[PDB]
Symmetry: D2
Subunit: 353 residues, 4 copies
């Protein structure tokens, strides 16, 4: 097609803008034209309220039409490497362009996804916030898949994905997670109905695990290099040995009656809303301690690195001597006989006896 | 009717309890019987999930059937002095029992009220939270009427009610309030669309005025003995001379660029969310000062009686020396160069630089 | 003393009002005089910012000096039956007037209480919010004692108090509660460090138990006529058989993986923040169901009496058909495939997918 | 220096790690060594709790030592182009390295900054959240300066900064802003004490203006291509003609009695907490309308593009027909005679009558 044909196709599309629907087709056409004229790789029509897209520039490699009202996508060029149409009303996707590297279709109404396993270059799949009941098998090229906030009852096999480093499958109805790929560096699967996590100890690169809001009673042996573990709101009474690489630990809303050990390099500990009666010594690396809403009548010595202390809703008669770099002290609702001396560093303070 | 007839009428009513509707007719019948047997003045069937009431004990003087699913009321005895059926699904009321002194029908679906002006003993009318578009003229005996949260566009004439001491007509669509009765001690008419308040200065007994959330640009001369004035969220830039009897003042969410004067006996001042750049000296009587969300770069000397200081969301570099009985200090979000010394009395503290 | 001596003593006291401390001694003197002149039983000097009280009218039976800055109390008349000086700075109390029936000294700085067991008429002791480390033994006349928010590590023996019907000892450091008196109708001891509750099954009149925020792992057999049980935030996985008299149940923040049974007349159930995976059928009497923040993928049929449904933060794909009298629906943060039909009765709605 | 000297200097520094202070000098040394060995341009020692840094690798171009407890910085290489030491305890900075392009020292305790005007390559200055009372004159190379949350009473001259495109000077005590540079694309100066904004109409590139929380009574003629205007919490009753480029408008907490006009391409309008009695027609481009807490008894037709409608705390009897792509409906606290039909698109709903 000649530019004129595109221009006219686009102007026609523009004229067809549903009156009053605030569709910014003029801007879109302008983007389309510029894209066509510049022979630009990417076309960005974000937040233009487009209820549809006209034919796309012929050699578009990247279609960014996020935040529109697209219920359908125009045919995608075989040159398309990146499709970012998150926040649209897409209920379906045509088979992916052979060169698709990035599939950004989060916040849509996708009921199902087209086959993905044959997408030799599909590295990122973001189908987060859709109505996916199932995910097609994933392409070996998959490095990242966000399929959170869907209605997935199962995830396709993942262990054989050589490059899958990040999985977001939170807010689904996963009862189990498939065995994880050795390459996995991160898995966010909170708010599912995971009875248990798959084996994790053999995941040397898994550094982030979010399995909060699940039905976990125990955690498997953790990834040896786990750095962030969020299992907030589960039924954990204990934690397996914690990788010393763990710097972020959220075991809030579990049923810990205490924390016997904390990783030596933990920066963040959120153990709020457990039944923590006592905290083991805190690692000097600890910067944020949230043990809010527990049954602590006493906090252990606060690490001098502690910047955020949230120990509100506990039975503290006293807050230990505050570290001099403490930025935040939320010890609200504690039978504090007196407020602790507040370091000048404290910027955020909340205390209530 | 004999007790047996009542018992049986009641047992029949009990048996007619919609299955599964959790109606506690058995308890109700038990109450009914006890009432009948004891010849008790009052029958209390609160929160029994009753979708209806059977015939009431013959000489019931007080019917308390609050929190049920009554869509209709059984015929009320001519001996009824008190009708408390708040929180029901009453869409209408039969003409009131001649001796009705208390009409408690708040939280119902009353579309209209039966004539009230001829209720020689109607002292309290609580039709709050209903679907009243209008209130019938009020009985001279009216001492209290709560008709708030209705769809009243007007209130009936009130100035001629010799004993009306309290009017709750907040949350209605009143554009104006009728002239108020000399007897009025309190008027709560916030959340209406009052363009102005009626003359108030000639209301020697009016001690409480709630005209918050209206369309007030100014307040009339206030009741000389006004004690509580809540005109929160209006378009006030100024206040008329404040009665020295004023102990409670809420002028929050108005457009005060400052407060030049405060009643000498003010206990509570909520001037939050105005554009207060400066506060006049605070009366030593002040116990609670809420000037949160203003444009104060400085607070005046805090009265030693001050117990609650909410000056958060201001431009305070410093919080003045805190009074020794200060219980609450919320100065969160102020460019505080430093937190003020916190009196040991402070139980509730919130500071954020 | 002659009135003049009192007047002058009072005027002298008035003149001694610390300048600027907002003490309303003039009003106090006015109250004092009126009390003296009227020979009134009660003297009410509430919220007058009084840092002290002058000699009290000679035959005062009731001293109400709540909300002042009293650090000391003037000698109390032997005729004093009621002492209400809550919200003051009292650190100590002289031995109680022999006729003291009501000891209202909540919100003070009482470090200790004078002997109470010999107060033949002491019926109500409110020493809530003080700095009591211990409570003196209680008088057999004690019907009500609120000693909550203190530093009590133990409560005096209570089982022998024939008329003790209400105990508020929440917010203390009670590890155990003494055996409860047969007369006990209510015990509020939340926010203590109760490892367990004392035997309760032999308390036929105990209808209210608040043992929230403690260290309860189990509850003893409950008072047979228990009506309200709040054991919010404890370590409960199970509940003993629930008295059918139970209408209020708060087992939120415990470790329930489910609720197998609910009292047949339960009006209120707060089981939020547990690990509830399933709810047993709800009693048709249920008006408020709060199972917010659980692991419910499904709610049981909602009782038609249900007025408040808080099932937010769960894994609900669907909210069951809403009862027609539902006033509140908070099902925010649930993977709801769709919002349920909202009954016209719903006044308070919050949904978030 | 030889690597060994650096290694040893670093190991010595490491050994000097204050015991128990959680300083991760080992990791730092590891980073230092790797940096030295790799001859890397950048050294990243973020969040290592370092109370000090040892001598830096000799040809470091970028020092990233954010989130540490640095109170002092080691001598910076003349090769340093980027200094990112935000979130430290730096009270002073030595004269900047001649090649400094990025000065990231936000969240420190800088009382003053070294001369900056002679930093020929200083493009980004981030001294946000410090204790700067004044900013040295800025270098002509300055493209971005964030000096927000300081104690600036004045900003240095800016109009002559040819490349200054972004100024963050919010949360200071600026009474006035210097004339703005033609190059300015964004100015965030909310929470100052700006009596007025400088002339803006001659700023063709100024697309973002945040002057919220100031003392603005009026806005100057706006930058012709202004896209985002946040003047939340000011004393605005009117707005100058709004650039049609305006897509983001926050005039919340001002004193608008209404909005007569809205930019045709406005996506976001936050006019909450004004005294808006009526809204002009909404541009079809409007995606978010927040007129919460106003005095609206009626909302205008909702643009079909509207995704977020926050009209809570108003006097709405009815919510206009909701657009089919509405994602959020917060109309809580409105005397709604009935809830509007909720489009299936609504994911976030809050209604309260
Ligand atoms: Ca045009
Ligand atoms: Ca969704
Ligand atoms: Ca270990
Ligand atoms: Ca707990
Ligand atoms: Ca708790
Ligand atoms: Ca029975
Ligand atoms: Ca209502
Ligand atoms: Ca005056
Ligand atoms: Ca303001
Ligand atoms: Ca503000
Ligand atoms: Ca006087
Ligand atoms: Ca206390
Ligand atoms: Ca049972
Ligand atoms: Ca849970
Ligand atoms: Ca949860
Ligand atoms: Ca090591
Ligand atoms: Ca700061
Ligand atoms: Ca115009
Ligand atoms: Ca307003
Ligand atoms: Ca309002």
């Amino acid at each position: 097609k000649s530019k004129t044909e595109y221009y006219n196709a686009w102007s026609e599309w523009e004229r067809n803008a549903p009156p009053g629907n605030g569709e910014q087709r003029e801007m879109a056409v302008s983007r389309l034209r510029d894209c066509l004229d510049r022979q630009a790789h990417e076309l960005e029509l974000n937040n233009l309220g487009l209820s549809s897209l006209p034919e796309l520039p012929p050699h578009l490699e990247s279609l960014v039409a996020s935040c529109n009202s697209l219920t359908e996508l125009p045919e995608l060029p075989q040159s398309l490497k990146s499709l970012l149409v998150d926040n649209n009303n897409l209920k379906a996707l045509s088979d992916l362009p052979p060169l698709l590297e990035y599939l950004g279709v989060s916040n849509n109404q996708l009921e199902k996804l087209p086959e993905l396993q044959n997408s030799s270059f599909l590295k990122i799949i973001d189908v987060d916030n859709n109505s996916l009941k199932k995910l097609p098998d994933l392409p070996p090229s998959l490095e990242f898949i966000a399929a959170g906030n869907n209605q997935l009852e199962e995830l396709p096999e993942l262990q054989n994905l050589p490059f899958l480093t990040a999985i977001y499958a939170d807010n689904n109805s996963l009862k189990k997670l498939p065995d994880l790929p050795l390459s996995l560096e991160s898995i966010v699967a909170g708010n599912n109905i995971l009875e248990e996590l798959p084996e994790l100890q053999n995941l040397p690169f898994l550094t982030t695990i979010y399995a909060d809001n699940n039905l976990l009673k125990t955690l498997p042996d953790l990834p040896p290099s786990l750095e962030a573990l969020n299992v907030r709101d589960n039924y954990l009474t204990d934690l397996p040995e914690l990788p010393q690489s763990l710097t972020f630990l959220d075991v809030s809303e579990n049923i810990f009656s205490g924390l016997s050990e904390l990783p030596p390099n933990l920066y963040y500990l959120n153990a709020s809303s457990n039944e923590i009666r006592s905290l083991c010594d805190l690692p000097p690396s600890l910067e944020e301690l949230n043990v809010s809403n527990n049954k602590l009548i006493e906090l252990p010595a606060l690490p001098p690195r502690l910047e955020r202390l949230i120990a509100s809703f506990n039975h503290l008669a006293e807050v230990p001597e505050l570290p001099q770099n403490l930025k935040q002290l939320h010890v609200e609702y504690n039978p504090l006989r007196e407020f602790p001396d507040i370091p000048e560093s404290v910027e955020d303070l909340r205390m209530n006896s």
